[PDB]
């Protein structure tokens, strides 16, 4: 029982720390469609991003809370989930901004009031 709460395209990348250099996701250079998805029972959250040529996963890893979530530029964001650290260089600045806005959200509802909103904007 999942939910996307964003898509992104962006090249997945990983880095190799023997070599000092970043190398692409699951081998292969190329963009992936990059998702969010939100377990509605658990609470929980995870990425996971597929190639868009041949569908290959190549990130599938869960949100912990308390990530440390950082925006290099404004197109390239990293973070550490495993022992690997994975970085996502994203295709327009459009698609960074709706994957970085919907990690932050799903980082404030892993982490944890206000009254109720307003009307939206007529």
Known sequence: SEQSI???????????????????????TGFSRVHIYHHTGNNTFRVVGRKIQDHQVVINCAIPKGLKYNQATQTFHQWRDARQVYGLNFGSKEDANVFASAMMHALEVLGGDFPPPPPPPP
Not at 18 to 23: E, I, Q, S, Y
């Open 6 to 28: 964003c898509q992104a395209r962006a090249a997945v990348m990983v880095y190799d720390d023997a070599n000092k250099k970043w190398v692409p996701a699951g081998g292969s």
